[PDB]
């Protein structure tokens, strides 16, 4: 009834049940949904899910997800320093990440409950989206190390394809995803 999670009736829920999600307030004023703080939240159930996931979904999924949290929860690591001296003077393995992740919440964390489609997904679809980004991180990491810069990479057309991306439906989805699977390796080595 406040916002102070300190208040008893709320808190008593935690530490009586597991799987806590918190829904940030200042997130949402902007415009996302059903955005949550994942720097508040925490589930417990997440290890005993591993069997079913392995088999049903993909055999390498939990590894591929932890690397997403690898950026995602680490990203605050830089966030703070941004607000201590701007994005200025954070150089390039620096501003790599910032931006990667920028997109990670701009596109992997915001659905709707009103967009006509794209508001429900299967794992295997979602799973897909998620593999792309990893790649993009990987090759970018090797982009700057090689001698070029993110600066233009951002302003590549191929970023926006990763952008709008979620919108296509399932039917197309396989092949959509396959098309970017070509587009990557060429669109790095070239430039």
């Amino acid at each position: 009834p406040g916002g102070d999670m300190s208040e008893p009736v709320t808190q008593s829920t935690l530490r009586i049940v597991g799987a806590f999600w918190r829904l940030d307030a200042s997130l949402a004023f902007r415009r996302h949904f059903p955005a949550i703080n994942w720097n508040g939240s925490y589930s417990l159930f997440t290890s005993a899910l591993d069997p079913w996931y392995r088999e049903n979904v993909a055999e390498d999924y939990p590894e591929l997800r932890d690397a997403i949290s690898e950026l995602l929860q680490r990203e605050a690591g830089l966030q703070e320093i941004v607000q201590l001296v701007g994005p200025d003077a954070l150089q390039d393995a620096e501003r790599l990440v910032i931006e990667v992740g920028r997109i990670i919440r701009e596109d992997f964390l915001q659905q709707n409950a009103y967009h006509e489609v794209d508001a429900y997904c299967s794992m295997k679809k979602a799973y897909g989206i998620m593999k792309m980004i990893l790649a993009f991180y990987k090759e970018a990491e090797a982009a700057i190390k090689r001698g070029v810069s993110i600066d233009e990479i951002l302003q590549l057309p191929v970023l926006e394809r990763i952008g709008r991306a979620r919108y296509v439906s399932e039917e197309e989805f396989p092949a959509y995803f396959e098309e970017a699977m070509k587009e990557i390796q060429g669109a790095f080595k070239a430039l």
Binding site: R31, Q83, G86, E160, Y167
Partner: protein
Amino acid sequence: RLMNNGVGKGKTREDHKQVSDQLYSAYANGVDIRKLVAIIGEDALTENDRRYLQFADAFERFFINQGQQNRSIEESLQIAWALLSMLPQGELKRISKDHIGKYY
């Protein structure tokens, strides 16, 4: 709350749904750099980000200001696109490709 009802579907122009969240989110995005600016320098922003701050003052000033002078649903919208105009395309992800060009 009640808004996803009665809008656009022969009830307003089909552009509405995507209008709002974009224009919305821009401004959100907007004032945000009102802060980061006032700490680091007087600016140090990039020429991408410049365009953002330029729209700040704008948004508030033209559009949200208004005389007693009434408006219409359509004339409003017009203006609306005019403030989306200033940001360059490829920055408006929240709108979809057709609608954007439809009335750019």
